[PDB]
From a paper:
Whereas almost all known bacteriophage-encoded RNA polymerases are single subunits, ΦKZ is one of only a few viruses to encode multisubunit RNAPs (msRNAPs). The ΦKZ non-virion RNAP (nvRNAP) is formed from these early genes by five polypeptides: gp55, gp68, gp71–73, gp74 and gp123 (10). Both gp55 and gp74 exhibit a degree of homology to the β’ subunit, whereas gp71–73 and gp123 represent similarly weakly homologous counterparts of the β subunit. Our structure confirmed the previously predicted homology of the split β/β’-like subunits, but further revealed that subunit gp68 is integral to the ΦKZ nvRNAP complex, interacting with both gp71–73 and gp55.
We resolved structures of the better ordered core regions of the complex by single particle analysis to a final resolution of just below 3.0 Å (FSC = 0.143), and a maximum of 73% of the complex to 3.3 Å (FSC = 0.143) after extensive sorting for the clamp. The ‘clamp’, a flexible element whose position is key to regulate the entry of single-stranded DNA into the active site, is also conserved and positioned similarly to its situation within the M. tuberculosis open promoter complex (RPo) structure. This region, lying within the gp55 N-terminal domain, exhibited particular flexibility, and was only ordered in the small fraction of the data yielding the most complete structure. The ΦKZ nvRNAP complex retains the conserved β/β’ architecture characteristic of msRNAPs, with a shallow active site channel running along the elongated side of the structure. One side of the enzyme is formed by the β’-like subunits, gp55 and gp74, with the β-like subunits gp71-73 and gp123 forming the opposing side, the internal DNA channel running between them through the centre of the complex as expected, and illustrated by complementary electrostatics. The DPBBs that form the catalytic core are contributed by gp55, which contains the universally conserved DxDGD motif that coordinates the catalytic Mg2+ (417DFDGD421) between β5 (403I-M405) and β6 (Q422-L427), and by gp71–73, which contains the two conserved lysines (K386 and K394) believed to be responsible for the interaction with DNA. The structural elements that govern the msRNAP reaction cycle are also conserved in ΦKZ nvRNAP; β’-like subunit gp74 contains the ‘bridge’ helix (L242-Y279) and the ‘trigger’ helix/loop, which switch between alternate conformations during nucleotide addition, although only the first helix of the ‘trigger’ loop (residues T365-V383) is well-ordered in our structure, as well as the conserved Zn2+ binding domain (C288, C341, C350, C353), known to interact with the promoter during transcription initiation. We also conducted subunit co-purification experiments in which we co-expressed pairs of subunits with one affinity-tag and assayed for recovery of both proteins.
Residue numbers in the entry:
A (entry chain A): 7 to 44, 150 to 213, 216 to 234, 247 to 486
B (entry chain E): 2 to 167, 322 to 471, 483 to 543
C (entry chain C): 2 to 592, 597 to 698
D (entry chain D): 137 to 384, 552 to 677
Write the structure that this text describes.
């Protein structure tokens, strides 16, 4: 509950409080509409609209009658008597221009936008029109909180919980069958040339005498073309990380249910082949998410800071080693793959020595 | 390799059907007869318009169709409406025909219409995008669902569970009964009922449902899974938006009124009934038989002309194994949409005239040996 | 049991009959084999399969080609872009348009036929059309052609009736480290023979809103796009567009700035660096009385536009002459009428008629519309999918050199390393008989090559193949040996070629290519493991089951201990190669950083990827603390933090390992755009979401 | 190890195929389920387990090493038995041959082709409803958090009956034995199979944190959890991964049953939660392998003190044990967590949400207010 009289005397902006109070749509729809437009008891006290309306008392209520016929709530009277100031001031605010989006051959509008009827406007008829506009205000705000907030495509479940982050990438995955570490990522040339653009601009403005336009042209020119200077600057940018193996990054899976679907790795090597467009991942980390080489695209985010890289240490490839089911047991994600085990099977379980009877005889 | 080896392989090899490998849409659409140059779509339009000739008033007569010149096509496409000629530069196969009605002589204004102009291999470009038009497996006669029996008609799409289509209520049951007895006598549906239901009027059809088809609700003889005895229609679902306009034009002279007309109302009704894009506006949005071409190869037998859709896939249990799947369809071919292998076109099947699926003889013994081994429990 | 007898015809198998041993593999893998066909592009090196069935002869007769539909006679032969001598001497004629009159008909219908340089149905995958040299020389304005005489065949159709859907490769079955999660270790010399072709088309407009730029030339010429048959620059920018301004004329409308390209404040089109330009189509509105383009920039545009206008003018003049000759009796095909109305749409309208407003799917053009079509060859390096015509598919994960490949004691070099342990799990045993029996075949064909005076793994010349045939007893013994091998493998083929006229030609066609092509249909009276035991327990027809030397991950020549057999396998390439990647350090914002349009102005995608969903931020709220997980969303939803991270990247002496980018003393928390929007929308309702102890 | 590489060829197939004990199990076999699964499969399963028969063959040495499965080898080297239709209807006559000697009759191969038809029924409603189940479970499980190492030292020890089927669920759990202080089970006790043992659960111990627990009350599972990790979500995660793996008989019915038990009113409202834990344990552990330390958190997340005064908060002594519905828990507690679930507008127009009550704290509270510290 916010005091509506407190927000309309501390605005200190344009102070245009009269929107409908002054205009009368007399050759003003070309100017007042496009340049400007392009605590509501009816939300809570709306249990009386079955086939008859208990709000037929139009104007001058002077609400002190405790005639409450309702079985759902008994603390509604305490909610009223706690803060009695409800829809008392005369200054009701207007929604901003950002809430309504207006082009092309046909002017397209959205169906929850039904609040422009209040912008287009004997006392017994005007007093009925004010409560008609108040019921239209409530009918607009209820359907806008139901169709634009409560839906899964909406402001709450899509934009208020984060979407479309910067310094990110999305590509298919391969494996590293090499002597390496368990946390190493190999970013290709085309992904690394665009994910690290301002880093290359800083390195080209520091090591060379180039402007930012020539540096941007040198970055965008050599995306699909290999050259030694960009590769040497990539090796320098990898070598600049003194306490880490490289640049700290996070790596996600699109079905994210378990702990292993969100990990943190380190960029250690940029590939030289321009035709290879894939991020090469460790072998031992393939088991904790359900990630195979079946043409799936996986997401990656780049942590800029040292504090963010230290805070992302809670999700690590070593964090899902211990199982969350048994008290003293390492989970099955540590198990090696097929061809890794089969060579040790052919090596160790071979007829290599004579038995113990023949050995000491 | 050795040429004699390829010669002996070619000598001992069953040949595919040339009508189905090249595309049955090529055969059942735009196939000119040697007597006169008239496509099969124009023949379907000519066979559809004379059915509703008994609903026409006295003096009104539909008089064939003529092929339009491209000089007429360029003026009819780029027609000035709001002092602007909007020419749609896009590669689209179309061709334009006329209607040419008449009312006691003195023939009226011709109404041009567009037609999709299919090509070899079930391929057609519309609005820049390539598409493939596949035929639909349609049973001859009536369909037996899990609850009721369905019959196809030209204007009604009713089922059979006590349900039909829809002081002053005495004229509604009279106007319904007026059109119920004469408008439901389409000749092509009387040729479609050649499975044993030989009726003359709909009042005998409702009798023969009650005395002969009454056991088709709980103890039917339809196997519900056999693909034998089908029509394989590709033109009945392609012109579904034109037959609706034909039925709505035929509803004007019979259901509304039966009084004397003039040329000023007839020209207005012809301009309001048959527009330029009657069969074109809902081709790539609702028709499930038209799919997007995504074949990165040269052979058309893989995904081009080897696609079949069922009677339920055209609208945009029954999955029991049958021995007729290996004859007309392709088993061990399971995509995501039809995992049972029912929507597939096998080139080694016998298809006679008008898409009538007839059974073969060399594989009949193995199918009869495998069918009785299935359903025994 | 009756393991020998079988009754399944080719008529009952739709697409399953393209390979033998269909009953050995599983049902799901056998369906995935049919699913994989139809997603395969055409590589440059195509060849026939070694185990040819009776199905591939029928699939080669129904393809996409340029055939004559009926018996007809050619009337006129037209061609776009005439090649001669001079300044307008552009080479490599893409299409030819011929017009015929249908012979043997009561109504002489006129038809049209286009012969292009290529044919592509997929968006970025197509094949070239090689022309028949016999038919193309007989293209005359007075010539009668019969029905179904093919012009411009595809590359998969050979001289005889076969179909090349893949490449034969020497596959070795080893438990290498690179074969993890269906991984492939491919040879570098084998991937050069598996090279698909991509045909792409880029379209742009330049009128009153914006104009072209001067690339591909020096300061004495203007060329907004490469010519037909030219090479694209090492950077992929083709016909970059600069906006139209008046007061920036000494700054931007100078010959120095027309040559250089600004990556910002411009709109370029990025394609493939190494690619040849195939086709160019230019549309033009020429009815406007002010010319929006400045002088000296419209030479190469009208150089194509005049040729296209002359071609469409002759194309309309032919139809007008045929209409003036055959009045009220003209019959035309449904493809020719669309070509005539297209020619009328290209040609300008007279002054008594209103001008046209051309549109391309609710997108109007402004006085120029230039589209180019180019062709590139894609070399596989990584994330390429392959399939051996079975259920087992894989992704190339490591590319070694030719000298570091597994080689046995007979000089055979391997092309692919596949893990063998996945065969018993997915139950696709059809790859066992193809790898094995061919190993009994090529080692036979390398035996009869080395029994006489020849050199293995090398194609013999005519002077040696004509000198080997002087010994009739040796080729008779070789024919008896091949007949015994066919009696072991395929008794129906052996009974077919028991009566073979001139049997020295069979020995010549075996010793020419080094492999005997074995015919094996779907109805074979063959006990498979009995033939296996006959091939193993015999002195002749035995494959070389010896050791295999290779090179490991380190630098060392490693010889394996177990006997390893290497055999032929027919591989193919698949759809969804690695090209749909994205990388963006900064994305444009909404007037809240979502963009969805024709985004082809950057090499690779520049769109923001929604890596943080609701479950992702839930897991980042539970595992990572709720404090530092709000900063990742605040660095995106607030544009000031998005400017501050780039300022910290560009002002530090080290671009990596920066401690603090957005300090919360100058840009504090609470400036998120959807949070403030929701707070404002709830404040106009009259309530607020706060708390107090 | 680069010289010792495993391989597979035709010789490895012919080495195991030409064994007489395998060839004897494929001839003179009646087409009966007892004659195939017990008689024909037993004679080859007794020779696959012999360690002195196949020495050096890569397939048998990979079978004994746990790489290759024996269920996929009986369908290749022995008689394949009774593939099914789309529905669960078996056939009368089975296929005679296996996968080495392939299937080449039309009837048998047409039956075999229906075995791969059920591997494609992957409609998007199943992947939608399992994500809806995870979003319904985790959003209510995320209330309890931040366990602490140590001991809360309470003598309010609960008592539960231990059976044979739920003995794996009582693996890491502290109980009170006679003449002893504390002991953990670890899952090797054949005794205590029918008695009622007094345990130490989270229901009824006293920690100064209002939403945290101790290590001895949670059991020996807490040391496998990292320090900065929500213990609330991981219970629903450990349930949901096994539920999704059971999804990927009628596991959707099990998922809806767990929804109706945990996040609905289908359970009878008991007086104390010590009799609600073994019923949920014997309902869950009979089909889904789940430890009881997760079930204790999933039961404790629906516990509210003083339901007659609308004090929607988690009680620290669990002896109260007052349970209500799931939607009343989502709406009438922690509105910042209520904005993450469906029907966001119903907690807005409620008179109970406009008065300052002492309530819990959801982690989403920082994403709702933008990230303000207070
Ligand atoms: Zn405790």
């Amino acid at each position: 509950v916010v005091d509506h009289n407190e927000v309309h005397d501390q605005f200190t902006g344009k102070r245009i409080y009269a929107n409908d109070y002054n205009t009368s749509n007399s050759d003003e729809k070309e100017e007042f509409d496009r340049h400007f437009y392009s605590r509501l008891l009816h939300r809570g006290f709306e249990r009386g609209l079955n086939h008859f309306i208990d709000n037929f008392n139009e104007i001058f209520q002077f609400l002190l009658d405790a005639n409450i016929i309702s079985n759902n709530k008994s603390e509604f009277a305490q909610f009223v008597a706690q803060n009695k100031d409800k829809l008392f001031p005369k200054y009701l605010p207007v929604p901003s221009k950002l809430c309504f989006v207006a082009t092309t051959s046909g002017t397209y509008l959205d169906k929850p936008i039904e609040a422009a009827i209040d912008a287009t406007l004997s006392p017994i008829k005007a007093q009925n029109r004010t409560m008609r506009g108040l019921r239209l205000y409530g009918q607009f705000y209820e359907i806008y909180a139901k169709s634009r907030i409560a839906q899964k495509p909406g402001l709450a479940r899509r934009h208020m919980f984060g979407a479309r982050l910067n310094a990110t990438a999305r590509a298919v995955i391969t494996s590293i069958s090499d002597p390496h570490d368990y946390d190493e990522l190999h970013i290709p040339w085309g992904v690394g040339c665009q994910l690290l653009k301002y880093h290359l601009t800083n390195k080209l403005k520091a090591k060379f005498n180039m402007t930012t336009r020539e540096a941007f042209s040198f970055v965008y020119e050599n995306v699909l073309q290999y050259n030694q200077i960009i590769a040497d600057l990539f090796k320098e940018l990898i070598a600049e990380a003194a306490p880490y193996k490289g640049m700290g990054c996070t790596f996600h899976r699109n079905p994210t249910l378990q702990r292993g679907s969100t990990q943190q790795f380190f960029i250690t090597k940029v590939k030289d082949d321009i035709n290879d467009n894939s991020i090469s991942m460790s072998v031992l980390c393939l088991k904790a998410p359900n990630a195979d080489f079946d043409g799936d695209q996986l997401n990656l985010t780049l942590m800029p800071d040292v504090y963010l890289t230290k805070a992302t240490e809670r999700i690590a490839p070593h964090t899902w080693v211990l199982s969350i089911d048994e008290p003293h047991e390492i989970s099955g994600n540590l198990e090696l793959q097929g061809p890794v085990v089969e060579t040790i099977i052919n090596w160790a379980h071979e007829k290599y020595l004579p038995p113990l009877e023949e050995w000491l005889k | 390799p050795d040429p004699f080896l390829i010669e002996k392989i070619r000598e001992n090899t069953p040949c595919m059907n040339p009508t189905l490998a090249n595309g049955i849409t090529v055969e059942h659409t735009m196939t000119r007869d040697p007597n006169t140059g008239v496509n099969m779509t124009r023949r379907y339009i000519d066979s559809l318009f004379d059915i509703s000739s008994v609903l026409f008033p006295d003096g009104f007569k539909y008089e064939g169709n003529r092929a339009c010149t491209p000089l007429k096509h360029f003026e009819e496409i780029t027609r000035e409406y709001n002092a602007k000629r909007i020419a749609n530069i896009a590669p689209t196969d179309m061709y334009m025909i006329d209607l040419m009605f008449s009312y006691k002589g003195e023939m009226l204004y011709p109404r041009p219409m567009l037609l999709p102009a299919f090509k070899r291999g079930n391929m057609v470009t519309i609005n820049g995008a390539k598409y493939i038009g596949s035929p639909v497996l349609t049973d001859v006669g009536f369909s037996v669902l899990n609850d009721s029996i369905f019959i196809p008609f030209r204007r009604t799409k009713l089922t059979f569970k006590q349900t039909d289509h829809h002081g002053k209520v005495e004229e509604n049951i009279d106007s319904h009964l007026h059109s119920f007895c004469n408008s439901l006598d389409e000749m092509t549906i009387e040729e479609l009922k050649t499975v044993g239901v030989n009726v003359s009027t709909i009042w005998e059809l409702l009798y023969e449902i009650m005395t002969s088809l009454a056991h088709h609700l709980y103890a039917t003889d339809i196997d519900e899974t056999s693909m034998y005895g089908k029509r394989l229609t590709v033109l009945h679902y392609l012109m579904s938006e034109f037959n609706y306009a034909v039925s709505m034009f035929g509803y004007m002279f019979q259901s509304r009124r039966d009084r004397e007309w003039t040329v000023q109302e007839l020209n207005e009704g012809l301009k309001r009934s048959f527009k330029l894009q009657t069969a074109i506006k809902r081709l790539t949005v609702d028709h499930g038989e038209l799919d997007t071409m995504s074949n990165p190869n040269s052979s058309m037998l893989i995904k081009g002309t080897s696609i079949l859709v069922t009677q339920d896939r055209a609208k945009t249990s029954s999955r029991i194994i049958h021995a007729s799947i290996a004859e007309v369809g392709q088993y061990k071919n399971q995509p995501k949409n039809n995992p049972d292998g029912r929507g597939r076109l096998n080139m080694y099947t016998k298809v006679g005239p008008t898409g009538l699926v007839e059974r073969r003889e060399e594989v009949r013994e193995i199918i009869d040996n495998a069918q009785l081994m299935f359903r025994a429990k | 049991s009756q393991l020998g007898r079988r009754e399944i015809d080719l008529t009952l198998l739709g697409h399953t009959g393209l390979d033998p041993w269909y009953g050995t593999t599983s049902s799901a893998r056998g369906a995935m084999f049919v699913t994989h066909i139809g997603q395969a592009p055409e590589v440059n090196g195509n060849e026939s399969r070694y185990f040819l069935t009776g199905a591939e002869l029928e699939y080669a007769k129904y393809t996409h080609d340029v055939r004559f539909p009926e018996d007809c006679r050619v009337l006129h032969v037209l061609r776009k872009y005439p090649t001669g001598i001079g300044k307008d001497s552009i080479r490599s004629n893409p299409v030819t348009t011929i017009i015929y009159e249908n012979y043997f008909d009561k109504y002489k219908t006129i038809g049209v036929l286009h012969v292009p340089e290529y044919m592509s149905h997929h968006q970025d995958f197509g094949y070239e059309l090689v022309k028949n040299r016999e038919v193309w020389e007989t293209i005359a304005p007075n010539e009668m052609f019969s029905k179904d005489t093919v012009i411009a065949q595809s590359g998969a159709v050979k001289k005889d009736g076969t179909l090349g859907m893949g490449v034969n490769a020497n596959v070795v079955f080893l438990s290498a480290a690179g074969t993890i999660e269906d991984g492939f270790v491919a040879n570098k010399n084998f991937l050069k023979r598996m090279m698909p072709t991509s045909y792409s088309t880029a379209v742009a407009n330049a009128g009153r809103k914006a104009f072209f730029l001067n690339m591909y030339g020096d300061d004495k010429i203007y060329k907004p796009f490469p010519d037909i048959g030219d090479v694209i620059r090492p950077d992929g920018v083709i016909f970059a567009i600069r906006d139209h301004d008046d007061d920036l004329a000494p700054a931007e409308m100078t010959p120095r700035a027309l040559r250089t390209l600004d990556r910002t404040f411009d709109r370029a089109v990025i394609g493939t660096p190494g690619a040849k330009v195939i086709d160019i189509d230019i549309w033009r509105d020429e009815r406007v009385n002010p010319s929006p383009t400045p002088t000296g920039m419209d030479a190469q545009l009208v150089k194509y536009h005049t040729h296209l206008s002359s071609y469409y003018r002759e194309l309309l003049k032919i139809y007008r002459g045929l209409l003036a000759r055959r009045k009220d009796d003209l019959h035309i095909t449904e493809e020719f009428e669309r070509l005539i109305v297209t020619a009328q749409m290209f040609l300008p309208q007279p002054d008594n008629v209103r001008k046209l407003s051309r549109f391309y799917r609710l997108d109007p053009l402004d006085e120029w519309r230039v589209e180019v079509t180019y062709k590139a060859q894609k070399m596989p390096a990584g994330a390429f999918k392959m399939t051996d015509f079975h259920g087992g598919k894989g992704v190339i994960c490591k590319v070694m050199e030719d000298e570091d490949m597994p080689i046995d004691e007979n000089g055979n070099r391997a092309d692919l390393i596949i893990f063998g342990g996945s065969t018993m799990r997915r139950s696709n045993y059809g790859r066992i008989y193809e790898h094995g029996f061919g190993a009994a075949a090529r080692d036979l064909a390398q035996r009869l090559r080395v029994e006489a005076g020849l050199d293995r793994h090398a194609k013999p010349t005519q002077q040696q193949l004509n000198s080997v045939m002087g010994n009739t007893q040796w080729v008779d013994y070789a024919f008896k040996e091949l007949l015994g091998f066919y009696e072991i493998i395929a008794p129906t083929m052996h009974s077919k070629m028991m009566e073979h006229p001139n049997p020295a030609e069979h020995v010549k066609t075996v010793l020419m290519d080094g492999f005997p092509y074995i015919y094996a249909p779907v109805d074979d009276p063959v006990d498979l493991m009995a033939a296996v035991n006959k091939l193993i327990n015999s002195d002749k027809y035995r494959p070389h089951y010896g050791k295999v030397s290779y090179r490991d991950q380190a630098g060392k020549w490693v010889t394996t201990k177990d006997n390893v057999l290497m055999g032929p396998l027919y591989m193919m390439l698949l759809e969804k190669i690695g090209e749909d990647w994205s990388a963006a350090a900064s994305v444009k914002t909404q007037p809240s950083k979502l963009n969805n349009a024709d985004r082809a102005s950057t090499p690779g995608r520049e769109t923001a990827i929604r890596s943080f969903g609701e479950s992702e931020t839930r897991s980042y709220n539970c595992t990572v603390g709720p404090g530092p997980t709000a900063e990742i969303l605040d660095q995106t939803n607030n544009p000031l933090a998005h400017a501050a991270v780039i300022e910290s990247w560009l002002t530090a002496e080290k671009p990596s390992s920066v401690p603090v980018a957005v300090d919360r003393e100058k840009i504090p928390f609470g400036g998120s755009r959807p949070v403030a929007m929701f707070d404002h929308l709830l404040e106009c309702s009259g309530i607020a979401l706060e708390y107090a102890p | 190890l680069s010289e010792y590489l495993a391989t597979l060829s035709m010789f490895d197939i012919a080495e195991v195929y030409n064994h007489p004990k395998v060839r004897e199990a494929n001839h003179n076999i009646e087409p009966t389920t007892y004659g195939i699964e017990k008689i024909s499969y037993g004679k080859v399963k007794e020779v696959f387990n012999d360690p002195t028969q196949f020495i050096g063959n890569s397939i048998i040495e990979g079978l004994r090493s746990g790489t290759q499965k024996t269920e996929q080898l009986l369908q290749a080297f022995a008689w394949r038995g009774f593939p099914t239709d789309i529905n669960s209807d078996i056939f009368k006559y089975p296929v005679t041959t296996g996968y080495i000697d392939g299937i080449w009759n039309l009837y048998e191969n047409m039956i075999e082709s229906r075995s791969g038809t059920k591997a494609l029924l992957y409609n998007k409603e199943l992947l939608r409803v399992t994500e809806y189940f995870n979003r319904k479970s985790q959003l209510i499980a995320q209330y309890v958090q931040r366990l602490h190492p140590g001991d809360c030292k309470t003598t309010i020890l609960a008592e539960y009956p231990v059976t044979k089927l739920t003995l794996k669920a009582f693996k890491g759990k502290y109980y009170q034995k006679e003449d002893g202080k504390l002991d953990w089970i670890r899952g090797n006790e054949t005794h205590l199979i029918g008695t009622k043992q007094k345990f130490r659960s989270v229901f009824g111990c006293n920690h100064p944190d209002s939403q945290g627990i101790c290590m001895t009350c949670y059991g020996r599972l807490g040391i496998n959890i990292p320090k900065g990790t929500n213990i609330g979500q991981v219970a629903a995660v450990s349930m949901g991964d096994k539920i999704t793996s059971a999804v990927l008989a009628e596991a959707g019915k099990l998922s809806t049953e767990k929804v109706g038990y945990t996040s609905k009113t289908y359970l009878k409202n008991y007086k104390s939660p010590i009799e609600a834990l073994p019923v949920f344990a014997t309902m869950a552990n009979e089909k889904i392998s789940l430890n009881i330390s997760h079930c204790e958190i999933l039961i404790y997340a629906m516990m509210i003190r003083s339901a007659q005064y609308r004090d929607y908060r988690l009680p620290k002594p669990g002896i109260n044990g007052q349970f209500e519905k799931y939607n009343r828990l989502m709406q009438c507690r922690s509105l910042g967590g209520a904005m993450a679930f469906e029907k966001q507008h119903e907690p807005l127009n409620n008179p109970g949400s406009f008065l300052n009550k002492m309530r819990n704290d959801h982690p989403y509270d920082l994403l709702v207010k933008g990230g303000k510290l207070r």
